[PDB]
């Protein structure tokens, strides 16, 4: 069964229940929340209107009682967010992390693939 989302920046999305471990390995939401501080400067810069949803869908993926795998982002949204936000990371000498490699996510939502295409 699913657990409430405790990460404040991941409230008020279309869903509000999750199930750890997330798509980046964290068993604890608080650990996900600390790691997310890595991105708060991008979040207030505002490189992408989708960054918030995207990060949340990875760090606290959607959970339903009816489906027994976590539901993360589709690759389309990942690519769109990366294209807007990686250049800002690059200005400061950083790069889009392997942990957020868009190839890890299903390319689109399907019969075969379940994922959130987001806002
Ligand atoms: C992302 O993953 C693929 C293999 O899954 C790899 O070829 C690629 O170089 C990785 N990194 C990217 C695209 O930056």
Numbering used by the authors: 44 to 162
Show the paper's wording:
Norrie Disease Protein (NDP) gene encodes Norrin, a secreted cystine-knot like growth factor, distinct from the lipid-modified Wnt. Unlike Wnts which have promiscuous interactions with Fz receptors, Norrin specifically binds to Fz4CRD, but not to the 14 other CRDs of Fz and secreted Frizzled-related protein (sFRP) family members. The Norrin mediated pathway maintains the blood-retina and blood-brain barriers and regulates angiogenesis in the cochlea and uterus as well as neuroprotective effects on retinal neurons. Our crystallographic and solution studies further reveal that dimeric Norrin forms a complex with two copies of monomeric Fz4CRD.
We determined two crystal structures of Fz4CRD. Similar to mouse Fz8CRD the Fz4CRD fold comprises four α helices stabilized by five disulphide bridges (Cys45–Cys106, Cys53–Cys99, Cys90–Cys128, Cys117–Cys158, Cys121–Cys145). The N-acetylglucosamines on two N-linked glycosylation sites at Asn59 and Asn144 are visible in the electron density map. Superposition of all Fz4CRD molecules in the asymmetric units from two crystal forms revealed a well-ordered protein fold. Structural comparison showed Fz4CRD closely resembles the CRDs of mouse Fz8 and secreted Frizzled-related protein 3 (sFRP3) with an average r.m.s. deviation of 1.2 Å over 115 equivalent Cα atoms and approximate sequence identity of 35%. Interestingly, we found that our Fz4CRD structures form the same dimeric assembly in two crystal lattices (r.m.s. deviation of 0.7 Å over 238 equivalent Cα atoms from two crystal forms). The dimer interface has an average 1330 Å2 buried surface area, in agreement with the characteristics of known protein–protein interfaces. However, this Fz4CRD dimer (front-to-front) is distinct from the previously reported crystal structure of mouse Fz8CRD dimer (back-to-back). Size-exclusion chromatography coupled to multi-angle light scattering (SEC-MALS) results showed Fz4CRD, Fz5CRD and Fz8CRD exist as monomers in solution at 50 μM concentration, in agreement with previously reported SEC studies of Fz8CRD and SEC-MALS analyses of MuSKCRD and SmoCRD. Taken together, our results suggest that the CRDs of Fz receptors exist as monomers and may not be involved in receptor dimerization; multiple GPCRs dimerize through their hepta-helical transmembrane domains.
